[PDB]
Protein backbone atom coordinates (compact mmCIF):
# COMPACT_ATOMS: atom_id res chain seq x y z
CA UNK A 1 0.00 0.00 0.00
CA UNK A 2 0.78 3.57 -0.78
CA UNK A 3 3.22 5.67 1.31
CA UNK A 4 1.69 9.17 2.51
CA UNK A 5 2.95 11.73 0.16
CA UNK A 6 5.66 13.95 1.24
CA UNK A 7 3.72 16.74 2.50
CA UNK A 8 1.77 14.71 4.72
CA UNK A 9 5.12 13.39 6.44
CA UNK A 10 5.24 10.23 4.13
CA UNK A 11 9.13 8.65 3.54
CA UNK A 12 11.32 9.62 0.95
CA UNK A 13 11.39 7.30 -1.78
CA UNK A 14 14.36 4.89 -2.43
CA UNK A 15 15.41 2.31 -4.49
CA UNK A 16 13.84 -0.02 -1.45
CA UNK A 17 10.38 1.15 -1.94
CA UNK A 18 10.20 2.20 -5.36
CA UNK A 19 6.98 0.55 -5.17
CA UNK A 20 5.20 2.91 -2.46
CA UNK A 21 5.42 6.49 -4.02
CA UNK A 22 1.84 7.80 -4.83
CA UNK A 23 2.61 8.63 -8.03
CA UNK A 24 -0.81 10.16 -8.56
CA UNK A 25 -0.91 12.59 -6.08
CA UNK A 26 2.02 14.45 -5.75
CA UNK A 27 0.67 18.31 -5.02
CA UNK A 28 2.32 19.60 -7.94
CA UNK A 29 2.71 20.12 -11.68
CA UNK A 30 5.22 20.45 -14.79
CA UNK A 31 5.51 24.23 -15.39
CA UNK A 32 5.19 24.27 -19.05
CA UNK A 33 1.29 24.81 -18.17
CA UNK A 34 -1.02 25.71 -15.30
CA UNK A 35 -3.43 23.94 -13.36
CA UNK A 36 -6.77 24.74 -11.43
CA UNK A 37 -8.83 22.51 -9.41
CA UNK A 38 -12.90 24.25 -8.86
CA UNK A 39 -15.74 22.87 -7.58
CA UNK A 40 -17.67 20.67 -9.53
CA UNK A 41 -21.16 22.32 -8.23
CA UNK A 42 -20.11 26.01 -7.08
CA UNK A 43 -17.51 26.65 -9.89
CA UNK A 44 -15.27 28.01 -6.90
CA UNK A 45 -11.65 27.67 -7.55
CA UNK A 46 -9.99 25.73 -4.91
CA UNK A 47 -6.42 25.66 -5.54
CA UNK A 48 -4.09 26.49 -7.98
CA UNK A 49 -0.88 25.86 -9.46
CA UNK A 50 1.69 28.74 -8.07
CA UNK A 51 2.50 29.67 -11.53
CA UNK A 52 -1.08 30.23 -12.62
CA UNK A 53 -0.22 33.58 -13.09
CA UNK A 54 2.00 32.89 -16.21
CA UNK A 55 -0.72 31.35 -18.12
CA UNK A 56 -4.14 33.05 -16.92
CA UNK A 57 -2.38 37.01 -16.18
CA UNK A 58 -5.10 37.27 -12.38
CA UNK A 59 -4.44 38.35 -9.41
CA UNK A 60 -3.08 35.38 -7.30
CA UNK A 61 -5.22 36.17 -4.29
CA UNK A 62 -7.89 36.79 -6.95
CA UNK A 63 -8.06 33.86 -8.07
CA UNK A 64 -8.29 31.41 -5.17
CA UNK A 65 -11.50 32.11 -4.13
CA UNK A 66 -13.06 33.43 -7.58
CA UNK A 67 -15.91 31.13 -9.68
CA UNK A 68 -15.25 29.38 -13.17
CA UNK A 69 -18.59 31.55 -13.66
CA UNK A 70 -16.72 34.69 -13.53
CA UNK A 71 -13.42 33.12 -14.75
CA UNK A 72 -14.59 31.61 -17.57
CA UNK A 73 -17.61 32.85 -18.39
CA UNK A 74 -18.23 30.97 -21.93
CA UNK A 75 -17.00 28.15 -20.61
CA UNK A 76 -18.49 27.43 -17.84
CA UNK A 77 -21.95 26.17 -18.67
CA UNK A 78 -20.30 23.98 -21.06
CA UNK A 79 -18.36 22.31 -18.35
CA UNK A 80 -21.76 21.46 -16.16
CA UNK A 81 -23.57 20.24 -19.41
CA UNK A 82 -20.11 17.79 -20.36
CA UNK A 83 -18.67 17.18 -17.21
CA UNK A 84 -22.01 16.86 -13.85
CA UNK A 85 -21.47 15.32 -11.33
CA UNK A 86 -20.92 11.68 -11.31
CA UNK A 87 -20.17 11.70 -15.30
CA UNK A 88 -17.33 9.01 -15.99
CA UNK A 89 -13.26 9.77 -14.84
CA UNK A 90 -12.45 9.73 -18.47
CA UNK A 91 -14.64 11.97 -19.80
CA UNK A 92 -12.57 14.98 -21.34
CA UNK A 93 -13.66 18.81 -22.36
CA UNK A 94 -11.64 20.78 -24.28
CA UNK A 95 -11.38 24.34 -25.56
CA UNK A 96 -9.79 26.74 -26.77
CA UNK A 97 -9.23 30.18 -25.06
CA UNK A 98 -8.34 33.12 -27.31
CA UNK A 99 -8.40 35.83 -25.08
CA UNK A 100 -4.40 35.46 -23.19
CA UNK A 101 -2.16 38.07 -24.89
CA UNK A 102 0.54 35.74 -25.74
CA UNK A 103 -1.10 33.03 -28.04
CA UNK A 104 -4.31 30.96 -27.59
CA UNK A 105 -4.14 28.93 -24.69
CA UNK A 106 -5.80 24.88 -24.91
CA UNK A 107 -7.76 24.13 -22.02
CA UNK A 108 -8.36 20.25 -20.70
CA UNK A 109 -11.12 19.62 -18.30
CA UNK A 110 -11.81 16.58 -16.60
CA UNK A 111 -13.88 15.48 -13.28
CA UNK A 112 -13.11 13.31 -10.40
CA UNK A 113 -15.46 12.77 -7.77
CA UNK A 114 -16.66 16.20 -6.35
CA UNK A 115 -13.56 18.38 -7.94
CA UNK A 116 -12.86 20.19 -11.84
CA UNK A 117 -9.32 19.56 -12.88
CA UNK A 118 -8.65 22.56 -15.32
CA UNK A 119 -5.17 22.16 -17.53
CA UNK A 120 -4.07 25.02 -19.08
CA UNK A 121 -1.63 24.68 -22.04
CA UNK A 122 -0.40 27.17 -24.96
CA UNK A 123 -1.81 26.28 -28.24
CA UNK A 124 0.63 25.18 -31.07
CA UNK A 125 -0.61 23.99 -34.49
CA UNK A 126 0.68 20.79 -35.54
CA UNK A 127 0.64 18.82 -38.80
CA UNK A 128 -5.73 13.08 -42.16
CA UNK A 129 -2.57 12.14 -40.39
CA UNK A 130 -4.37 10.18 -37.71
CA UNK A 131 -6.98 7.72 -40.29
CA UNK A 132 -3.81 6.98 -41.88
CA UNK A 133 -1.35 5.94 -38.86
CA UNK A 134 -4.50 4.04 -37.78
CA UNK A 135 -4.30 2.09 -41.42
CA UNK A 136 -0.76 1.86 -40.75
CA UNK A 137 -1.19 0.12 -37.99
CA UNK A 138 -4.31 -2.40 -39.02
CA UNK A 139 -2.15 -2.97 -42.23
CA UNK A 140 0.71 -4.91 -40.23
CA UNK A 141 0.11 -8.92 -40.61
CA UNK A 142 1.90 -9.58 -38.00
CA UNK A 143 2.94 -8.39 -34.04
CA UNK A 144 6.71 -7.75 -35.06
CA UNK A 145 5.45 -5.77 -38.08
CA UNK A 146 2.95 -3.63 -36.01
CA UNK A 147 5.54 -2.57 -33.29
CA UNK A 148 8.16 -1.54 -36.56
CA UNK A 149 4.92 0.31 -37.81
CA UNK A 150 4.11 1.94 -34.61
CA UNK A 151 7.25 2.84 -33.66
CA UNK A 152 7.57 4.33 -36.79
CA UNK A 153 4.36 5.51 -37.35
CA UNK A 154 4.68 7.60 -33.99
CA UNK A 155 7.88 8.64 -34.74
CA UNK A 156 6.35 10.41 -38.18
CA UNK A 157 4.14 12.13 -36.07
CA UNK A 158 6.00 13.36 -33.33
CA UNK A 159 9.69 14.12 -34.09
CA UNK A 160 10.97 12.39 -31.16
CA UNK A 161 14.59 11.29 -31.33
CA UNK A 162 13.83 7.92 -30.15
CA UNK A 163 10.41 6.00 -30.18
CA UNK A 164 10.65 2.09 -28.80
CA UNK A 165 7.80 -0.62 -28.33
CA UNK A 166 9.02 -1.26 -24.26
CA UNK A 167 7.47 -4.99 -24.04
CA UNK A 168 6.81 -6.25 -20.76
CA UNK A 169 7.45 -10.16 -19.47
CA UNK A 170 5.49 -11.85 -17.12
CA UNK A 171 7.95 -11.01 -14.71
CA UNK A 172 7.27 -7.83 -15.09
CA UNK A 173 10.79 -6.76 -16.55
CA UNK A 174 11.07 -4.80 -19.71
CA UNK A 175 12.65 -5.20 -23.00
CA UNK A 176 12.64 -2.94 -26.26
CA UNK A 177 11.67 -5.02 -28.87
CA UNK A 178 11.27 -2.53 -31.80
CA UNK A 179 12.60 1.29 -32.13
CA UNK A 180 12.76 4.00 -34.61
CA UNK A 181 15.13 6.64 -34.26
CA UNK A 182 17.23 9.80 -35.08
CA UNK A 183 20.06 9.25 -37.23
CA UNK A 184 23.03 8.23 -35.26
CA UNK A 185 21.78 7.36 -32.46
CA UNK A 186 22.68 4.07 -30.42
CA UNK A 187 20.16 1.18 -30.36
CA UNK A 188 18.48 0.38 -27.26
CA UNK A 189 17.05 -2.42 -29.06
CA UNK A 190 17.49 -6.00 -27.13
CA UNK A 191 17.92 -3.97 -23.83
CA UNK A 192 16.30 -5.98 -20.51
CA UNK A 193 15.52 -4.05 -17.75
CA UNK A 194 14.44 -4.80 -14.12
CA UNK A 195 10.78 -5.08 -13.17
CA UNK A 196 11.80 -2.38 -10.47
CA UNK A 197 12.29 0.68 -12.99
CA UNK A 198 8.69 1.11 -14.16
CA UNK A 199 7.00 -0.06 -10.80
CA UNK A 200 4.05 -1.66 -10.11
CA UNK A 201 2.07 1.10 -8.79
CA UNK A 202 3.25 3.22 -12.18
CA UNK A 203 2.09 0.15 -14.30
CA UNK A 204 -1.36 -0.14 -12.67
CA UNK A 205 -1.86 3.42 -12.91
CA UNK A 206 -0.87 3.21 -16.65
CA UNK A 207 -3.95 0.62 -16.89
CA UNK A 208 -6.11 3.21 -16.33
CA UNK A 209 -4.22 6.87 -17.52
CA UNK A 210 -3.03 5.49 -20.90
CA UNK A 211 -0.65 8.93 -21.61
CA UNK A 212 1.83 10.57 -19.39
CA UNK A 213 4.74 12.43 -20.17
CA UNK A 214 7.95 14.63 -18.65
CA UNK A 215 8.21 17.79 -21.04
CA UNK A 216 11.52 18.48 -19.28
CA UNK A 217 13.51 16.44 -17.24
CA UNK A 218 15.43 19.34 -15.73
CA UNK A 219 12.20 21.48 -14.62
CA UNK A 220 11.39 21.87 -11.13
CA UNK A 221 7.95 20.97 -9.73
CA UNK A 222 5.38 23.83 -9.34
CA UNK A 223 2.98 23.08 -6.33
CA UNK A 224 -0.92 23.67 -5.90
CA UNK A 225 -1.41 25.97 -3.59
CA UNK A 226 -3.15 25.04 -0.80
CA UNK A 227 -1.96 21.49 -2.16
CA UNK A 228 -4.90 19.50 0.30
CA UNK A 229 -8.00 19.62 -1.70
CA UNK A 230 -10.39 21.95 0.88
CA UNK A 231 -13.10 19.76 0.28
CA UNK A 232 -11.33 16.96 1.81
CA UNK A 233 -8.42 18.19 3.62
CA UNK A 234 -7.30 15.20 1.23
CA UNK A 235 -4.73 15.01 -1.99
CA UNK A 236 -5.95 15.91 -5.21
CA UNK A 237 -6.09 13.02 -7.59
CA UNK A 238 -4.02 14.13 -10.26
CA UNK A 239 -3.61 10.81 -12.31
CA UNK A 240 -5.45 11.96 -15.05
CA UNK A 241 -3.76 15.28 -15.56
CA UNK A 242 -1.14 15.65 -18.00
CA UNK A 243 0.22 18.22 -16.27
CA UNK A 244 1.21 16.28 -12.99
CA UNK A 245 4.57 16.02 -11.54
CA UNK A 246 6.90 12.99 -12.75
CA UNK A 247 8.16 10.95 -10.01
CA UNK A 248 11.36 12.15 -9.23
CA UNK A 249 13.01 8.71 -9.27
CA UNK A 250 11.82 8.59 -12.65
CA UNK A 251 13.18 12.40 -13.60
CA UNK A 252 16.71 11.40 -12.24
CA UNK A 253 16.47 8.01 -14.38
CA UNK A 254 15.76 9.99 -17.21
CA UNK A 255 18.57 12.69 -16.80
CA UNK A 256 21.07 10.10 -16.30
CA UNK A 257 19.83 8.36 -19.53
CA UNK A 258 20.45 11.53 -21.33
CA UNK A 259 16.44 12.18 -21.97
CA UNK A 260 15.48 15.97 -21.99
CA UNK A 261 11.49 15.02 -22.12
CA UNK A 262 9.70 12.01 -21.95
CA UNK A 263 6.24 10.66 -23.04
CA UNK A 264 4.59 7.34 -23.18
CA UNK A 265 1.42 5.66 -23.99
CA UNK A 266 -0.33 2.58 -22.47
CA UNK A 267 -0.83 -0.69 -24.89
CA UNK A 268 -3.47 -2.27 -22.88
CA UNK A 269 -4.41 -5.85 -23.53
CA UNK A 270 -7.10 -8.30 -21.13
CA UNK A 271 -7.17 -5.20 -18.64
CA UNK A 272 -3.36 -6.05 -18.09
CA UNK A 273 -0.24 -3.89 -19.32
CA UNK A 274 1.02 -5.54 -22.36
CA UNK A 275 4.18 -2.68 -22.84
CA UNK A 276 4.49 1.11 -23.81
CA UNK A 277 5.06 2.96 -26.71
CA UNK A 278 8.26 5.20 -25.10
CA UNK A 279 9.54 8.15 -26.63
CA UNK A 280 12.70 10.12 -25.79
CA UNK A 281 13.67 13.34 -27.17
CA UNK A 282 17.58 15.11 -26.26
CA UNK A 283 16.39 18.13 -25.39
CA UNK A 284 13.13 19.47 -23.38
CA UNK A 285 9.98 19.10 -26.01
CA UNK A 286 6.25 20.26 -24.77
CA UNK A 287 3.65 18.12 -27.36
CA UNK A 288 0.52 20.31 -27.76
CA UNK A 289 -2.91 18.47 -26.69
CA UNK A 290 -4.04 17.39 -30.13
CA UNK A 291 -0.93 15.57 -31.34
CA UNK A 292 -1.34 14.12 -27.65
CA UNK A 293 -5.06 13.05 -28.53
CA UNK A 294 -3.57 11.54 -31.74
CA UNK A 295 -0.99 9.37 -29.94
CA UNK A 296 -3.89 8.68 -27.10
CA UNK A 297 -6.15 7.44 -30.42
CA UNK A 298 -3.29 5.52 -32.11
CA UNK A 299 -2.50 3.76 -28.11
CA UNK A 300 -5.78 2.55 -28.09
CA UNK A 301 -5.67 1.67 -31.85
CA UNK A 302 -2.56 -0.20 -31.03
CA UNK A 303 -3.90 -2.12 -28.12
CA UNK A 304 -6.79 -3.18 -30.22
CA UNK A 305 -4.63 -4.55 -32.79
CA UNK A 306 -2.55 -6.42 -30.14
CA UNK A 307 -5.44 -8.06 -29.12
CA UNK A 308 -6.84 -9.02 -32.28
CA UNK A 309 -3.88 -10.42 -33.21
CA UNK A 310 -3.17 -12.68 -30.33
CA UNK A 311 -6.52 -13.83 -30.37
CA UNK A 312 -6.47 -14.99 -33.59
CA UNK A 313 -2.80 -16.67 -33.22
C1 LIG B 1 13.06 3.02 -7.26
C2 LIG B 1 12.23 3.68 -8.34
C3 LIG B 1 12.60 3.87 -9.61
C4 LIG B 1 11.73 4.32 -10.71
C5 LIG B 1 10.39 4.44 -10.65
C6 LIG B 1 9.42 4.96 -11.65
N1 LIG B 1 9.45 4.88 -12.97
C7 LIG B 1 8.40 5.46 -13.53
C8 LIG B 1 8.03 5.61 -14.95
C9 LIG B 1 8.72 5.07 -16.16
N2 LIG B 1 9.89 4.43 -16.21
C10 LIG B 1 10.18 4.12 -17.48
C11 LIG B 1 11.42 3.35 -17.82
C12 LIG B 1 12.12 3.35 -18.96
N3 LIG B 1 12.05 4.23 -19.97
C13 LIG B 1 12.96 3.87 -20.90
O1 LIG B 1 13.16 4.46 -21.95
C14 LIG B 1 13.65 2.64 -20.46
C15 LIG B 1 14.70 1.90 -21.17
C16 LIG B 1 15.12 2.19 -22.40
C17 LIG B 1 13.12 2.34 -19.27
C18 LIG B 1 13.46 1.18 -18.36
C19 LIG B 1 9.14 4.55 -18.31
C20 LIG B 1 9.00 4.39 -19.82
C21 LIG B 1 8.22 5.18 -17.46
C22 LIG B 1 6.91 5.79 -17.96
C23 LIG B 1 6.94 7.33 -17.94
C24 LIG B 1 7.54 7.88 -19.21
O2 LIG B 1 7.21 7.36 -20.30
O3 LIG B 1 8.35 8.84 -19.16
C25 LIG B 1 7.63 5.95 -12.56
C26 LIG B 1 6.35 6.73 -12.66
C27 LIG B 1 6.61 8.09 -13.35
C28 LIG B 1 5.39 8.97 -13.33
O4 LIG B 1 4.45 8.71 -14.13
O5 LIG B 1 5.33 9.93 -12.51
C29 LIG B 1 8.30 5.62 -11.32
C30 LIG B 1 7.79 5.98 -9.95
N4 LIG B 1 12.49 4.37 -11.83
C31 LIG B 1 13.71 3.84 -11.62
O6 LIG B 1 14.58 3.77 -12.48
C32 LIG B 1 13.86 3.32 -10.21
C33 LIG B 1 15.13 3.95 -9.59
Known sequence: PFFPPLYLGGPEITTENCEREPIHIPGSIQPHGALLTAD?????????????????????TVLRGQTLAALLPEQWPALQAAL????????????????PAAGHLSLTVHRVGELLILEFEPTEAWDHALRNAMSALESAPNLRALAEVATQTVRELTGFDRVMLYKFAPDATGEVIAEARREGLHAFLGHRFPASLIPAQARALYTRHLLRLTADTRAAAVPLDPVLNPQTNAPTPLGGAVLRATSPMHMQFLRNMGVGSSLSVSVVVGGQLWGLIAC??????????????????????????????????
Request: with cysteine; glycine share 8%.
Open 280 to 313: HHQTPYVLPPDLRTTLEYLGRELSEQVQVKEALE
Open 40 to 60: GHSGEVLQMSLNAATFLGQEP
Open 84 to 99: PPGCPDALQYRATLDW
